[PDB]
Design a protein around this ligand. Structure first.
Ligand code: ICS
Ligand code: ICS
Ligand SMILES: [Cl-]
Ligand SMILES: [Cl-]
Ligand code: NA
Lengths: 522, 477, 522, 477
């Protein structure tokens, strides 16, 4: 039943007694459910070191991964170019998922097409799908560019993208001059960040490889910036802001910040802003190219160094104090522009915030996950704050990256208790936060289920989730925030210290039991 | 608009297309005539999508793993292939359940064989056998395993059926191989059918010779309600207040034992015709269990459905049915009294999957609203056969609508509200059009039954009449 | 005891069994404590309507006020002027408190002097303290300006500030040309916001009253901006940012954002930035003067209209959508500068966020308090979001203000359940959130004790606190935030919706009880 | 720095002052000589602050309401006057307690008469009487009221003593009038004295003719411990482990009954000499109760104090004293072993109020650190008498230091750590100097006793050796 003036949705509707009774009869009558004592017994077992050992012996089963598949990153890369339609050659189910996934993180429209290959392509190939798909897409959505990636169906069957596109142009399904860069993006290799790299290098090749003869490094006096797979709008904006602040000429290659933040003013803009084709064509004339996330831009790096002859500098992701410092010092050396007084002041304000919050941050223990560059920058900044990264998980990381993160940890006393895990998933992590409990988790929305599990053991075992990463589905507008530069370091620091103080307030809210420490001032 | 104006709208919109796509899409767009019973002469459906036109459709894996099997709560469903499908479909659908997740229930977990290239090249059957042993060790209270095939499984020639037989025999466990690879069919719909056949072949017959279940004359099963936001619970309560015993729910909050007990019921109550009519027809032929379609959206349809269901039993059930109707009468009448004045005359355009584009019309009409356009991603012509009589004359119908078409139709028709999915929502909110998610219920609901109607009405009002929609134009523009 | 590798501070040290046992013996042995049953019975009583009625019959007792005293606002005003030392004529205890209050909110140094009147000065007045005080302050801290306010002791004994300052100059304690504006700021009149108004008029008078002959309105083609009592650095910054965006010439009169955010770079800067004396002298030549918080700038308004002859526009605080729109339109009309595309786009992005979050915000009920202009702007924005302000408390509001807010409430369906309270305190509000419980409170750190009280009744009665206002002592760096303009509206919206979602996640985290609604996507 | 260099530093700093201020401030700055026994031969104290020099001192209301009376948990303390004082001092001092706030304890609440102009012109005595009635109605479990006079009360000629007598008789309730107006005295210090006299005159004697309390030879009171971060609790546990019975704590976690029971104890243990020596001397004169000073900062002083206290009783208390020392020996030795290597040799400057600037020196030395300068806001010469033998030779002493002096001293001496208050903290952090709040313990603590030494050590190390302090200079500068 419902009271018209106090309508209840599922929570708390189904706590009503009549629903509780009905669900009890359903369980007892027909579910043949395990007794609650057995359920409690098994749950307790899944929190033990014994279970953890069996868990970490898995060789074939993956549970609750912390990565996605390549074409997701190719789509996000493609969205960053002016009037470009992302186009995934293969099966349409994938595109439905790519769009929904980004829709839920950004809360924005996300355009992407498929050419809807069906079972007949398993025998005959997908050329006709490409021919008609390119003509249909161009006519209906009027992109200036179509950037092609692939689903795993197309990869297993071996569709020759170059031949299909070339025949499409030969036969007049699209004009010969219409830009159709492409990349093979197999979901059974790497992860979504690999697909970003593959799509970017494919676009860069399309516009420069056959026109290198007139290029001269440095002749346009700009620096190219390649962001990689980036799902915080503030990160595109902070890089552009700091470079403009220094008067540094730059080209951000793949820039989706406008199209993922269009105003709600009565009209839907399928396209907005983005890197221009001329910027790609002119990129070889830059002074140099800087890769903001080098650990998933290895193929782009090979092409930039090997073809454009740019001496790509060895920079970490500009996260935290030291690596933001190093980024600005390198940009200054390449551009000849001094670091202005405004950025020197912003740096000092971040240091001031670190001094202000260091007592609450000191020694705090974290479990964290994400993509390789994000994770290593987060670890580095935690160390700078005097925090202890304890469980560091990168499902899609490799042995070289692990080696590099272990070295960063070895250089600080705050890394003594840290272990780096690669190839491990959030069911592995769940075991680690039971057997070697940290104070918090730093991660994406999938961590909410680990927090639920830990609370079930008891309130003193609960590990709260701090939401930094991708995807974040259960809070609104966190995609607008920033993790790079001094600005992003201030935001992370504020989030961490106030997460600590919120939890302390919760633990000391108990009247006459724990509220002796419910201080007004912290 | 007149029939001519709508016909002209259709033809104007189609002028963007190349000839091949124009000729095809023309067959999937129609102006409604409520007298039509053979919809195939007005609109074509369940055909392949035209390449590159931005269909909203998903794949057969979504219809099998996402829709039919995923909800079964005490089984472990393996997404078998590379890592994407299982991750994008992890906990996106609000098929609600009661259980202890990770211990005895597993719905919101993503179990996957995470194919790498070595698995494509040498095949995944050895990895699958090992994965099954690891599942059995780390999740000992699971009551069964399903294997949901992603695109590469059939393309590389793996034999998951033999693994399931050998491992199921070895471990005395139900292991269901499902060939729902996303290149099969043309949409989610074939996955429903593939999923139904796997239930039939590997699960449903297991108690055929077991006569220890104590039957009653009033045993029914809810077939095709996936308990979105609790929808099936707010349906089940009314059936049991009517005096019936709901032995099983397929598959919202559903257990594998419930499924195995379904062949013992007296009547199957089919809500989602599209996704479950296959198994319902099988159960009549094999077990002699009749089935009927019903509709629990809004009070008019819920009352009619309760009365139609009760009519299949004896007078005692029909008496309790009129007692249920009397009990809830003041409740839905209060909802109508409050919200209909706020919504009367408002026009709605719907676009959803295979049932709701016609099933929710009565609920909107119970609030004085008018559905001026509707369509399906993946319905068949027997779905459209059931939709024409429910829609007004000269309303717009669209099958597997394209992104371009849907936007152009909305710009011309100017509905007060649109109800569709997550890939549509944020487009129309930029345009300043109120929008309600009619798959996920916008994280609200239930909408089924009397208790759901109150929430439905509240939700349509909160969004349609929200202050935010009056502010999109800057006052200096 | 302590484990050296797991040292425990007060919480949870005193939960050790030996400390629990000792504290039980202290209570039983010597505290003659009321029985726990009686304590429980009286607590329950304080949550009832019967207790509320007695509570609201108070005429002499105030409990837990939501306001401070005038000289606090005078100091904040004075800090916003270049190389200016705030100086409070009167007793030194007041200054130790003013500084500490701001230290804890801003986590920054706060400089301010007293002339330390003692009981001698109570009998004979404080002229000698003023003479030596001005001389000592100028020589020691080398300010270019000393801005003088008063403590209640000096007001009660009736010190003549004008004469004392004139005599300090006549007798040579400070140069006659040295600027020493002043204001009487009695703590038994109004509140801290009155002190700001009084101090600002005094500074404005000092620099313009006797020099109006050569002034022509509009001759400098700028707009004066008077911010009022403002403790979010973001609010100073967003106003300057938007006006520079439109290319409007402006003069922010009282600007402490530089001095309250100096970098931690190795040197302490007593003074930084601020409104210059030249800017004050020239202010009458502006086109007009805009008051960001008119409800505590009445005395400044009279002077600006009466002496400068500025047609001060009738504008509300620029909070929320409508009132930021009206602010920008009025600035456009006065300056002749059009609203640029960038601010139109920012406006549309706010509206987009409002459409994105409206379902979770609809109908949510709030209790809130603060200063008059802040409170009414928060009430206005909540109405624009479809939320229900229920309990609106302004301890230092007046009847004219209450009438204006009741009119805002009456013009919106979402205001039907709201009541505006003036002269009531947070012990009054505590009763209201028990008897007519809202979903959240919006207020300053003192609200944490109301949340504690509500939780003690039971989890279902708990009213969580959302921290927006002044002072905020128990979280770090929130003083950096913004509440004005579209930027401030976006930040408030995000804070409100994610507080709602955080609490829903807490209520649905219980396994097999409420986690059926523990959705990944919201 | 040598004796002569510290003297030159003093003289150079004093050059900025006008002659009158220079002459006075010279008398409040000294180079320490541990040989001297009469400190008034080297330094003057407890004098009026020079106007306009930014003293760090508070007022007498702070010393009385904020310090002595406010911690008493089961009484209600009225900040009598306008709204500022009670608001700025609401819950700023971490004088911890166990109670149900708003019901049977009131420490962190702000009760005020919120004077308006009418109350100034016509007087507040009628308001106070009505306020007392309202307190009794709305907080019936309060066990007494104090009236903490703010500046205007004495200036307008109010008679809070008559109100308290009349209302106290009428309601059979202890109502304590305190004339702690902030214009009285020169600092917090006179507030202490006024507060002590109020306790003496209105509370302490209520059980003088009641013989029902059964004393024992081991009954003590902790006098002058305000339980900052739990300090008194980690002090009380040691004393009772030694076999003593702590009958009262003044006034951290204190109750009015235990104050009234204090004349029945056998020994008054005084931690804060400055604030509570007055009532200690009174109880010696009136009840014959001895008092002794002790120090529970760090293991060396804590052991010295336990042994000095136990020697006043008998062999059994002394045997229990050595068992306490033996129990905690491995605990504090582990603290030293971990943290002294991290802190050995580091130099610290202190500036606090009236006790800790000398009382914490031994704890720093137990970690190998050296206090190179110290001083007090409001100490008297008997405090400096006790400080010079605790400080090294040729160190720097400053009484009522100005903001300018302290910054200039710090710039020259270059300490590794500074320990002072909230109005100093953020100045020195900007300069890149590690800073620890030595009033509030930076929201940490306790620091008293063996359990507090662990926290003290952890806290000094975390701040002094924090990574943040190595980053203040931009690498490009
Ligand atoms: S057709 Fe229906 S909303 Fe029965 S319109 Fe919708 S692919 Fe849902 S709960 Mo999306 S009645 Fe199918 C459905 Fe269920 S699109 Fe799919 S998941 S089983
Ligand atoms: S110990 Fe006490 S609050 Fe007696 S807790 Fe406090 S360094 Fe004060 S008035 Mo800060 S009883 Fe000492 C004190 Fe006085 S910290 Fe200092 S100044 S003379
Ligand atoms: Cl889960
Ligand atoms: Cl409180
Ligand atoms: Na493998």
């Amino acid at each position: 039943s419902q009271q018209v003036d106090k309508i209840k949705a599922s929570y708390p509707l189904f706590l009503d007694q009549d629903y509780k009774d009905m669900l009890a009869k359903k369980r007892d009558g027909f579910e043949e459910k395990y007794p609650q004592d057995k359920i409690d017994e098994v749950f307790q077992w899944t929190t033990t070191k014994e279970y953890q050992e069996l868990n970490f012996q898995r060789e074939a089963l993956t549970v609750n991964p912390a990565k996605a598949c390549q074409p997701l990153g190719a789509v996000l890369c493609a969205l960053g170019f002016e009037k470009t339609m992302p186009y995934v050659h293969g099966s349409q189910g994938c595109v439905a998922y790519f769009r929904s996934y980004f829709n839920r993180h950004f809360r924005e429209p996300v355009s992407c097409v498929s050419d809807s290959m069906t079972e007949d392509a398993a025998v005959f190939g997908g050329q006709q799908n490409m021919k008609d798909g390119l003509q249909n897409c161009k006519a209906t959505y009027k992109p200036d560019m179509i950037a092609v990636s692939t689903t795993c169906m197309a990869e297993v069957i071996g569709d020759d993208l170059n031949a299909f596109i070339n025949n499409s142009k030969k036969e007049g399904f699209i004009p010969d001059e219409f830009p159709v860069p492409f990349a093979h993006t197999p979901s059974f290799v790497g992860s979504h960040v690999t697909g970003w790299d593959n799509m970017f290098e494919g676009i860069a090749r399309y516009f420069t490889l056959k026109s290198m003869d007139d290029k001269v490094v440095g002749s346009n006096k700009k620096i190219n910036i390649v962001p990689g797979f980036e799902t915080y709008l503030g990160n595109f904006r902070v890089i552009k802001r700091m470079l403009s602040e220094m008067g540094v000429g730059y080209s951000l290659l793949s820039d989706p910040e406008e199209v993922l933040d269009t105003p709600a003013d009565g009209q839907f803009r399928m396209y907005a802003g983005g890197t221009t084709q001329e910027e790609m064509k002119d990129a070889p004339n830059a002074l140099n190219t800087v890769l903001l996330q080098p650990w998933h831009l290895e193929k782009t790096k090979k092409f930039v160094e090997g073809t454009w002859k740019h001496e790509v500098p060895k920079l970490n992701i500009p996260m935290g104090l030291d690596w933001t410092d190093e980024f600005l010092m390198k940009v200054s050396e390449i551009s000849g522009q001094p670091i202005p007084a405004s950025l020197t002041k912003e740096r000092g304000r971040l240091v001031g915030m670190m001094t202000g919050s260091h007592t609450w941050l000191h020694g705090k223990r974290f479990a964290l996950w994400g993509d390789p560059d994000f994770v290593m920058g987060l670890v580095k900044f935690l160390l700078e704050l005097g925090c202890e990264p304890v469980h560091i998980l990168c499902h899609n990381g490799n042995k070289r990256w692990k080696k590099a993160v272990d070295a960063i940890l070895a250089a600080s006393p705050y890394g003594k208790n840290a272990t780096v895990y690669i190839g491990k998933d959030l069911w592995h992590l769940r075991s680690l936060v039971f057997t070697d409990k940290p104070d918090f988790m730093i991660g994406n929305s999938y961590g909410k289920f680990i927090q639920r599990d830990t609370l079930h053991k008891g309130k003193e075992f609960e590990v709260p989730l701090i939401r930094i990463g991708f995807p974040i589905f259960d809070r609104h507008h966190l995609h607008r925030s920033t993790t790079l530069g001094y600005e992003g370091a201030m935001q992370i620091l504020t989030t961490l210290v106030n997460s600590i103080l919120e939890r302390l307030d919760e633990e000391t809210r108990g009247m006459q039991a724990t509220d002796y420490n419910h201080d007004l001032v912290r | 608009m007149s029939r001519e104006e709508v016909e002209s709208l259709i033809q104007e919109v189609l002028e963007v297309y190349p000839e091949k796509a124009r000729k095809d899409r023309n067959k999937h767009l129609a102006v409604n005539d409520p007298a039509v019973t053979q919809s195939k002469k007005c609109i074509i459906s369940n055909k392949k999508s035209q390449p590159g036109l931005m269909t909203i459709r998903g794949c057969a894996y979504a219809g099998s793993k996402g829709v039919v099997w995923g909800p079964i709560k005490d089984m472990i469903h393996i997404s078998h292939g590379p890592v994407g499908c299982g991750q994008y479909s992890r906990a996106g659908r609000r098929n609600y359940y009661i259980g202890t997740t990770g211990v005895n229930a597993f719905v919101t977990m993503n179990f996957t064989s995470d194919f790498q290239e070595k698995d494509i090249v040498f095949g995944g059957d050895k990895k699958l056998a090992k994965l099954i042993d690891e599942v059995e060790t780390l999740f000992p209270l699971n009551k069964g395993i399903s294997v949901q095939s992603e695109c590469p499984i059939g393309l590389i020639g793996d034999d998951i059926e033999s693994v399931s037989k050998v491992k199921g025999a070895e471990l005395s466990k139900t292991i269901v191989p499902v060939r729902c690879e996303g290149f099969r069919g043309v949409s989610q719909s074939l996955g429903h059918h593939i999923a139904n056949d796997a239930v039939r072949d590997w699960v449903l017959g297991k108690r055929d010779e077991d006569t220890t279940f104590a039957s009653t004359p009033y045993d029914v099963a809810i077939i095709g309600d996936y308990n979105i936001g609790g929808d099936a619970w707010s349906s089940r309560i009314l059936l049991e207040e009517m005096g019936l015993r709901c032995v099983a729910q397929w598959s919202g909050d559903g257990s594998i034992s419930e499924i195995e007990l379904t062949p013992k019921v007296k009547l199957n109550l089919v809500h989602c015709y599209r996704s479950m009519n296959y198994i319902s027809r099988h159960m009549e032929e094999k077990y002699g269990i009749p089935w009927m379609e019903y509709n629990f959206f809004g009070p008019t349809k819920t009352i009619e459905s309760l009365r139609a269901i009760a009519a299949k039993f004896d007078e005692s059930i029909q008496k309790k049915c009129e007692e249920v109707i009397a009990k809830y009468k003041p409740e839905w009448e209060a909802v109508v009294a409050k919200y209909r004045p706020r919504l009367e005359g408002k026009r709605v355009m719907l676009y959803i999957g295979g049932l709701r584009p016609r099933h929710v019309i009565g609920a909107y009409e119970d609030l004085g609203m008018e559905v001026v356009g509707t369509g399906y991603e993946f319905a068949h012509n027997d779905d459209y056969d059931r939709t024409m009589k429910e829609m007004g004359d000269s309303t717009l119908l669209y099958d597997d609508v394209t992104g371009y078409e849907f936007e152009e139709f909305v710009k011309r028709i100017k509905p007060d509200l649109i109800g569709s999915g997550i890939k549509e929502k944020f487009i129309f909110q930029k345009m300043g059009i109120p929008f309600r998610q009619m798959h996920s219920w916008d994280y609200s609901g239930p909408y089924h039954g009397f208790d759901g109607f109150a929430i439905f009405a509240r939700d349509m009002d909160m969004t349609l009449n929200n202050p935010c929609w009056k502010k999109l134009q800057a006052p200096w523009e």
